[PDB]
Amino acid sequence: RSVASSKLWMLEFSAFLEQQQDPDTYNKHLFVHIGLEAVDIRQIYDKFPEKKGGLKDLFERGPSNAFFLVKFWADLNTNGSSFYGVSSQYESPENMIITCSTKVCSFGKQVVEKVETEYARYENGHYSYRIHRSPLCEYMINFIHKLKHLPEKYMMNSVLENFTILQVVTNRDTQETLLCIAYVFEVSASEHGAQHHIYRLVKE
Protein backbone atom coordinates (compact mmCIF):
# COMPACT_ATOMS: atom_id res chain seq x y z
CA ARG A 1 0.00 0.00 0.00
CA SER A 2 2.20 2.84 -1.32
CA VAL A 3 -0.26 5.64 -2.10
CA ALA A 4 -1.99 5.41 1.25
CA SER A 5 -2.71 7.82 4.07
CA SER A 6 -4.29 6.85 7.41
CA LYS A 7 -7.76 6.99 5.84
CA LEU A 8 -7.49 6.00 2.14
CA TRP A 9 -5.39 3.90 -0.18
CA MET A 10 -5.27 4.11 -3.95
CA LEU A 11 -4.87 0.49 -5.11
CA GLU A 12 -5.27 1.13 -8.83
CA PHE A 13 -4.86 3.98 -11.29
CA SER A 14 -4.68 3.64 -15.05
CA ALA A 15 -5.09 5.81 -18.14
CA PHE A 16 -5.84 3.85 -21.29
CA LEU A 17 -7.00 3.87 -24.86
CA GLU A 18 -9.54 1.18 -25.78
CA GLN A 19 -10.18 0.49 -29.45
CA GLN A 20 -13.22 -1.48 -30.58
CA GLN A 21 -12.06 -3.66 -33.48
CA ASP A 22 -15.52 -5.23 -33.90
CA PRO A 23 -18.55 -5.57 -31.52
CA ASP A 24 -16.80 -8.52 -29.79
CA THR A 25 -13.16 -7.43 -29.91
CA TYR A 26 -11.46 -4.66 -27.94
CA ASN A 27 -7.79 -3.73 -27.85
CA LYS A 28 -6.64 -1.82 -24.79
CA HIS A 29 -3.41 0.13 -24.42
CA LEU A 30 -2.27 1.39 -21.01
CA PHE A 31 -0.53 4.79 -21.08
CA VAL A 32 0.25 4.68 -17.35
CA HIS A 33 -0.68 2.25 -14.55
CA ILE A 34 -0.31 1.65 -10.84
CA GLY A 35 -1.88 -1.61 -9.67
CA LEU A 36 9.18 5.15 -0.38
CA GLU A 37 11.89 7.77 -1.04
CA ALA A 38 11.12 11.36 0.00
CA VAL A 39 10.94 14.47 -2.21
CA ASP A 40 11.26 18.04 -0.97
CA ILE A 41 7.89 19.51 -1.97
CA ARG A 42 9.47 23.00 -2.30
CA GLN A 43 11.34 21.67 -5.38
CA ILE A 44 8.01 21.14 -7.22
CA TYR A 45 5.71 23.91 -5.94
CA ASP A 46 6.33 25.93 -9.16
CA LYS A 47 4.77 23.15 -11.30
CA PHE A 48 1.43 23.30 -9.47
CA PRO A 49 -1.28 25.84 -8.58
CA GLU A 50 -0.42 28.34 -5.86
CA LYS A 51 -2.59 30.48 -3.55
CA LYS A 52 -5.44 29.21 -1.33
CA GLY A 53 -6.39 25.61 -2.15
CA GLY A 54 -3.17 25.21 -4.17
CA LEU A 55 -0.47 22.62 -3.42
CA LYS A 56 1.38 24.64 -0.77
CA ASP A 57 -1.86 25.53 1.06
CA LEU A 58 -3.05 21.88 0.97
CA PHE A 59 0.34 20.58 2.13
CA GLU A 60 0.55 23.07 5.01
CA ARG A 61 -2.97 22.13 6.15
CA GLY A 62 -1.98 18.43 6.23
CA PRO A 63 -1.97 15.66 7.23
CA SER A 64 1.57 15.28 5.93
CA ASN A 65 1.09 11.52 5.35
CA ALA A 66 -1.50 12.18 2.63
CA PHE A 67 0.96 13.73 0.15
CA PHE A 68 2.62 11.88 -2.71
CA LEU A 69 4.51 12.55 -5.89
CA VAL A 70 4.28 10.01 -8.71
CA LYS A 71 6.79 10.06 -11.57
CA PHE A 72 5.33 8.31 -14.61
CA TRP A 73 7.12 7.12 -17.70
CA ALA A 74 4.18 7.02 -20.12
CA ASP A 75 3.80 4.44 -22.88
CA LEU A 76 2.74 6.29 -26.00
CA ASN A 77 3.37 3.35 -28.36
CA THR A 78 -0.17 2.89 -29.68
CA ASN A 79 -2.41 3.66 -32.64
CA GLY A 80 -14.51 6.62 -34.39
CA SER A 81 -14.02 3.42 -32.36
CA SER A 82 -11.77 4.83 -29.62
CA PHE A 83 -12.39 5.31 -25.92
CA TYR A 84 -9.84 7.21 -23.82
CA GLY A 85 -10.42 6.54 -20.12
CA VAL A 86 -9.03 6.53 -16.60
CA SER A 87 -9.95 4.03 -13.90
CA SER A 88 -8.96 4.06 -10.23
CA GLN A 89 -9.85 2.17 -7.05
CA TYR A 90 -9.51 3.08 -3.38
CA GLU A 91 -9.99 1.35 -0.06
CA SER A 92 -10.82 2.77 3.39
CA PRO A 93 -11.70 1.46 6.86
CA GLU A 94 -14.37 4.20 6.85
CA ASN A 95 -17.56 4.68 4.83
CA MET A 96 -17.15 8.20 3.48
CA ILE A 97 -18.44 10.21 0.63
CA ILE A 98 -15.31 11.23 -1.23
CA THR A 99 -14.63 13.82 -3.89
CA CYS A 100 -11.80 13.40 -6.36
CA SER A 101 -10.58 16.57 -8.05
CA THR A 102 -8.12 16.16 -10.91
CA LYS A 103 -6.39 19.28 -12.21
CA VAL A 104 -4.38 19.41 -15.43
CA CYS A 105 -1.69 22.07 -15.13
CA SER A 106 0.66 23.74 -17.55
CA PHE A 107 3.56 25.79 -16.28
CA GLY A 108 1.92 25.49 -12.87
CA LYS A 109 -1.39 27.03 -14.05
CA GLN A 110 -4.69 25.08 -13.92
CA VAL A 111 -5.96 24.36 -17.42
CA VAL A 112 -8.89 22.00 -16.66
CA GLU A 113 -10.37 20.34 -13.61
CA LYS A 114 -12.50 17.19 -13.41
CA VAL A 115 -14.48 16.64 -10.22
CA GLU A 116 -16.00 13.29 -9.23
CA THR A 117 -18.02 12.21 -6.24
CA GLU A 118 -17.76 8.61 -5.10
CA TYR A 119 -19.73 6.57 -2.58
CA ALA A 120 -18.53 3.53 -0.60
CA ARG A 121 -19.28 -0.14 -1.15
CA TYR A 122 -18.91 -2.52 1.77
CA GLU A 123 -16.18 -5.07 0.98
CA ASN A 124 -14.82 -7.49 3.61
CA GLY A 125 -14.95 -5.28 6.71
CA HIS A 126 -13.50 -2.32 4.77
CA TYR A 127 -15.01 -0.03 2.10
CA SER A 128 -14.18 0.28 -1.61
CA TYR A 129 -14.46 3.22 -4.00
CA ARG A 130 -14.07 2.88 -7.71
CA ILE A 131 -13.92 5.51 -10.42
CA HIS A 132 -14.66 3.23 -13.39
CA ARG A 133 -13.81 4.34 -16.98
CA SER A 134 -13.93 8.07 -16.30
CA PRO A 135 -13.78 9.60 -19.79
CA LEU A 136 -10.51 11.40 -20.43
CA CYS A 137 -11.15 15.12 -21.15
CA GLU A 138 -10.73 16.50 -24.63
CA TYR A 139 -7.72 18.54 -23.56
CA MET A 140 -5.88 15.36 -22.57
CA ILE A 141 -6.94 13.50 -25.73
CA ASN A 142 -5.67 16.50 -27.80
CA PHE A 143 -2.45 16.74 -25.74
CA ILE A 144 -1.68 13.06 -26.38
CA HIS A 145 -2.36 13.62 -30.10
CA LYS A 146 0.01 16.59 -30.25
CA LEU A 147 2.72 14.73 -28.31
CA LYS A 148 2.68 11.73 -30.68
CA HIS A 149 2.80 14.06 -33.70
CA LEU A 150 6.06 15.69 -32.59
CA PRO A 151 9.08 14.47 -34.65
CA GLU A 152 11.36 13.53 -31.74
CA LYS A 153 11.10 11.79 -28.36
CA TYR A 154 13.31 14.51 -26.86
CA MET A 155 10.68 17.06 -27.90
CA MET A 156 7.99 15.04 -26.04
CA ASN A 157 9.97 15.16 -22.78
CA SER A 158 10.66 18.87 -23.31
CA VAL A 159 6.91 19.50 -23.52
CA LEU A 160 6.26 17.21 -20.55
CA GLU A 161 8.69 19.17 -18.31
CA ASN A 162 5.91 21.73 -17.89
CA PHE A 163 2.85 19.50 -17.86
CA THR A 164 1.57 18.13 -14.56
CA ILE A 165 -1.55 16.63 -12.96
CA LEU A 166 -2.71 17.22 -9.41
CA GLN A 167 -5.19 14.79 -7.85
CA VAL A 168 -6.85 15.74 -4.56
CA VAL A 169 -9.18 13.25 -2.90
CA THR A 170 -11.19 14.76 -0.08
CA ASN A 171 -13.81 13.64 2.45
CA ARG A 172 -16.71 15.66 1.00
CA ASP A 173 -18.34 16.41 4.39
CA THR A 174 -15.23 17.28 6.43
CA GLN A 175 -12.95 18.56 3.62
CA GLU A 176 -10.06 16.53 5.10
CA THR A 177 -7.41 15.71 2.48
CA LEU A 178 -7.44 11.89 2.22
CA LEU A 179 -4.85 11.77 -0.61
CA CYS A 180 -3.06 14.39 -2.62
CA ILE A 181 -1.05 13.11 -5.54
CA ALA A 182 1.21 15.21 -7.73
CA TYR A 183 2.01 13.60 -11.10
CA VAL A 184 5.07 14.32 -13.24
CA PHE A 185 5.79 12.75 -16.65
CA GLU A 186 8.41 11.58 -19.13
CA VAL A 187 8.00 9.27 -22.14
CA SER A 188 8.91 5.61 -21.66
CA ALA A 189 11.87 4.29 -23.70
CA SER A 190 11.63 0.88 -22.05
CA GLU A 191 10.95 -2.47 -23.67
CA HIS A 192 8.82 -3.12 -20.56
CA GLY A 193 6.46 -0.17 -21.28
CA ALA A 194 4.97 2.22 -18.71
CA GLN A 195 6.85 2.57 -15.44
CA HIS A 196 6.58 4.68 -12.27
CA HIS A 197 8.28 5.69 -9.04
CA ILE A 198 6.21 6.79 -6.03
CA TYR A 199 7.63 9.31 -3.53
CA ARG A 200 6.47 10.80 -0.22
CA LEU A 201 6.29 14.61 -0.33
CA VAL A 202 8.08 16.18 2.65
CA LYS A 203 8.48 19.74 3.92
CA GLU A 204 12.27 19.87 3.50
Binding site: W73, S106, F107, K146, E161, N162, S188, H197
Partner: protein, 40 residues
Protein backbone atom coordinates in the same frame (compact mmCIF):
# COMPACT_ATOMS: atom_id res chain seq x y z
CA UNK B 1 4.85 38.88 -21.55
CA UNK B 2 4.98 35.17 -22.39
CA UNK B 3 1.98 33.02 -23.43
CA UNK B 4 0.93 29.81 -21.62
CA UNK B 5 -1.50 28.02 -24.03
CA UNK B 6 -1.61 24.72 -25.94
CA UNK B 7 -0.29 25.89 -29.34
CA UNK B 8 2.33 28.02 -27.53
CA UNK B 9 3.53 24.97 -25.53
CA UNK B 10 4.20 22.80 -28.59
CA UNK B 11 5.30 25.81 -30.71
CA UNK B 12 8.00 26.52 -28.12
CA UNK B 13 9.52 23.09 -28.67
CA UNK B 14 8.77 22.67 -32.41
CA UNK B 15 10.03 26.14 -33.36
CA UNK B 16 12.29 27.40 -30.54
CA UNK B 17 13.02 30.68 -32.40
CA UNK B 18 9.44 31.86 -31.87
CA UNK B 19 9.07 30.49 -28.30
CA UNK B 20 7.28 32.73 -25.80
CA UNK B 21 6.51 30.52 -22.80
CA UNK B 22 7.81 30.93 -19.20
CA UNK B 23 11.42 29.90 -18.68
CA UNK B 24 12.14 27.31 -16.03
CA UNK B 25 14.74 25.20 -14.23
CA UNK B 26 14.94 21.78 -15.96
CA UNK B 27 13.95 18.91 -13.67
CA UNK B 28 17.37 17.26 -14.11
CA UNK B 29 19.03 20.28 -12.52
CA UNK B 30 16.87 20.33 -9.39
CA UNK B 31 17.52 18.75 -5.96
CA UNK B 32 15.70 15.47 -6.71
CA UNK B 33 16.53 11.81 -6.03
CA UNK B 34 18.68 10.00 -8.60
CA UNK B 35 15.89 7.45 -9.09
CA UNK B 36 13.75 10.28 -10.47
CA UNK B 37 15.51 9.94 -13.83
CA UNK B 38 16.25 6.20 -13.73
CA UNK B 39 13.10 4.13 -14.46
CA UNK B 40 12.77 0.61 -13.01
Amino acid sequence: DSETDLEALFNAVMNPKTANVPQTVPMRLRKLPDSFFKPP
